[PDB]
Design a binder for this molecule. Structure first.
Ligand code: B8E
Ligand code: CL
Ligand code: NA
Lengths: 87, 53
């Protein structure tokens, strides 16, 4: 592909591990971007991780182990942004 | 006059011909695209974050 967009779900006390919710490529990525902005879902540029999840990740499966370290950084960033935005 | 009658076979043939129509094929594709758009909105709403390249 040229463009990649991958959805990740992680809610502490609900999901024991993070889940892959979607995988889109190319033409569908601009559409995903619009809907994410409209729905208040954060969209982060992580070129190595998006590329890695493109090859390995399966929709409605847990994030693979090969990407959990890189995913945990994104998740810890998202939690820090959430707590800070409450100020 | 003798009453016209479409056989079960004629009805199937006329309908298959209709399914071959460019306008009718286009509407099927359009319907599939609308379900994909709906699914895309639901997939995004179910997510915590989106990672992009
Ligand atoms: C970079 O984070 C770690 O030390 C790795 C790790 N993260 C895990 C995890 C589980 C649930 C949510 C987010 C991360 S399990 C596991 C062995
Ligand atoms: Cl909505
Ligand atoms: Na998908």
């Amino acid at each position: 592909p040229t463009h990649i967009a991958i959805g990740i779900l992680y809610k502490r006390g609900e999901t024991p591990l993070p889940l892959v919710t979607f995988k889109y490529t190319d033409a569908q990525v601009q559409t995903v971007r619009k809907i994410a902005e409209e729905e208040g879902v954060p969209i982060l540029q992580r070129i190595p991780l998006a590329r890695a999840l493109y090859w390995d990740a399966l929709v409605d499966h847990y994030i693979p182990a090969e990407q959990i370290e890189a995913t945990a950084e994104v998740l810890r960033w998202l939690e820090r942004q959430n707590i800070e935005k409450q100020h | 006059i003798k009453e016209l009658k479409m056989s079960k076979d004629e009805i199937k043939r006329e309908y298959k011909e209709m399914e071959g129509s460019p306008e009718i094929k286009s509407k099927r594709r359009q319907f599939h695209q609308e379900i994909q758009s709906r699914n895309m909105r639901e997939n995004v709403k179910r997510s915590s974050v989106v990672v992009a390249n």
